[PDB]
């Protein structure tokens, strides 16, 4: 992977849909606002946009870690902007800091993600081996 | 809220479905395995099951923090079990540790969550204030 510039920024913009509110299996609807786990999905997405421009032939990125602190809320129908910035790269691991804002400009979340860069063949091999073990059962 | 016993555990079990694999807006399908954000959703779910039995009338819990390290994979069709454990409660903040396993028993993820306990009226007021501010733009 080519070296990612320090502070390289990638963004993901969306609008909170009804399907993005806090709703769990078993428990059902909980809160009529943008869910933390949806924010996490979008933070991972913004983080992935940081590495795509730099991936070399046969390389792939896989999510390895995520953390997010939910500071404020975003209501259904509101625009949401997620901004990921390259913090550093250690070996084959890319670190990014992320921030999310709602339509009114409120900071609704802060987080960090880690992505591991591996040959697509290696990734396929890992999933392949897991499948074999499962079949062996 | 009634005091939660130290080490109190709650579990959530499910089967990985195709809808739970790594797939993003704009980018599309990425990896055919249980997604980290889906694991996070389920860790939040297990964590909430910890406070529900202790919430007193009028109280509510809201997710405040989530953290997860994805160690191994879970394939579609595999059973997954998420275990949340009450670590401690400070003020109105409940701290829980979480660990997840796939059908083969592999540790697929470890993390932590934080939930804030507040009166349902307070929660509704917070969402209401936000909506009033949004309306104020028009």
UniProtKB/TrEMBL annotation, chain A:
Coiled coil: none annotated. The active site is at 36, 44, 70. Residues 16-120 form the Fluoroacetyl-CoA-specific thioesterase-like domain. InterPro entries: FlK, FlK-like_dom, HotDog_dom_sf. This is Fluoroacetyl-CoA-specific thioesterase-like domain-containing protein. It comes from Thermus thermophilus (strain ATCC 27634 / DSM 579 / HB8).
């Amino acid at each position: 992977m080519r070296p990612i510039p320090e502070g390289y920024e990638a963004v993901f913009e969306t609008v909170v849909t009804p399907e993005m509110t806090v709703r769990f299996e078993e428990l059902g609807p909980v809160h009529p606002v943008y869910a933390t786990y949806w924010m996490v999905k979008h933070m991972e997405l913004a983080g992935r946009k940081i590495i795509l421009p730099f991936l070399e032939e046969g390389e792939e990125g896989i999510g390895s870690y995520v953390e997010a602190r939910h500071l404020a809320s975003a209501l259904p129908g509101m625009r949401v902007r997620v901004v990921a910035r390259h913090e550093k790269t250690e070996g084959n691991r890319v670190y990014a800091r992320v921030e999310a804002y709602n339509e009114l400009g409120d900071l609704i979340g802060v987080g960090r993600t880690e992505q591991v860069i591996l040959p697509k063949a290696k990734v396929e091999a890992l999933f392949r081996r897991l499948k074999e073990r499962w079949e062996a059962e």
